[PDB]
C-alpha cells in the first residue's frame, strides 16, 4: 500500500512513534518519505553486500529481519523479512523501534542524515492533526 502523508502521520502517532527514544514524529515521517516514498511493499537489493531493505522504513536484512539469503545475517527483530511487505505497519514499527534502541538511533539510516537531519521537518506533519 502507498500511504497518503497525513494518513501515515496519524497511524504512526497511534502506534506510539512520537518522541520514541527522543525521535519526533516529523523525523519518522521524513525517514519513510525518503526511504520508500511511503510504500509498504518497497524492496531494495544492495548488490554490494548481498542484503535487501524491506518495507516502508527499508529495514535491512543483514541485522534486523531474516530473509535466509543474506550471508552472515542476524534477525534482531525476530521477523521474517516477508512480514514487512504487508499493508499493515505494526511489524515495521515494532522493528524500527528496535533499530533505534541501538546507540546509533535513527542515524542507522544514512538517508536520515542526508535528507532530514538539521532540517525544518515540520512540513511532513503540517495539517495532519497530529
Swiss-Prot record:
Residue span, C-type lysozyme domain: 1-130
Record-given protein name: Lysozyme C
Reaction(s) catalysed by this chain's protein: Hydrolysis of (1->4)-beta-linkages between N-acetylmuramic acid and N-acetyl-D-glucosamine residues in a peptidoglycan and between N-acetyl-D-glucosamine residues in chitodextrins
Additional note from the record: Lysozyme C is capable of both hydrolysis and transglycosylation; it also shows a slight esterase activity. It acts rapidly on both peptide-substituted and unsubstituted peptidoglycan, and slowly on chitin oligosaccharides.
Subcellular location, record wording: Secreted
Catalytic residue list: 35, 53
A GO term, aspect molecular function: identical protein binding
Gene: LYZ
SUPFAM superfamilies: Lysozyme-like (SSF53955)
Keywords: Amyloid, Amyloidosis, Antimicrobial, Bacteriolytic enzyme, Disease variant, Disulfide bond, Glycosidase, Hydrolase, Secreted, Signal
Enzyme Commission code(s) on record: 3.2.1.17
Stretches of the chain forming a coiled coil according to its record: none
Amino acid at each position: 500500500k502507498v500511504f497518503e502523508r497525513c494518513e501515515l502521520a496519524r497511524t504512526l502517532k497511534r502506534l506510539g512513534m512520537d518522541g520514541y527514544r527522543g525521535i519526533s514524529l516529523a523525523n519518522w515521517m521524513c525517514l519513510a518519505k525518503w526511504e520508500s516514498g511511503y510504500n509498504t511493499r518497497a524492496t531494495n537489493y544492495n548488490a554490494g553486500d548481498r542484503s535487501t531493505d524491506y518495507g516502508i522504513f527499508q529495514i535491512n536484512s543483514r541485522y534486523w529481519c531474516n530473509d535466509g539469503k543474506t550471508p552472515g545475517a542476524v534477525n534482531a527483530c525476530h521477523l521474517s523479512c516477508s512480514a514487512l511487505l504487508d499493508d499493515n505497519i505494526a511489524d515495521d514499527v515494532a522493528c524500527a523501534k528496535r533499530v533505534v534502541r541501538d546507540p546509533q538511533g535513527i542515524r542507522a539510516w544514512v538517508a536520515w542524515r542526508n535528507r532530514c537531519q538539521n532540517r525544518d521537518v515540520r512540513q511532513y506533519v503540517q495539517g495532519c492533526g497530529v
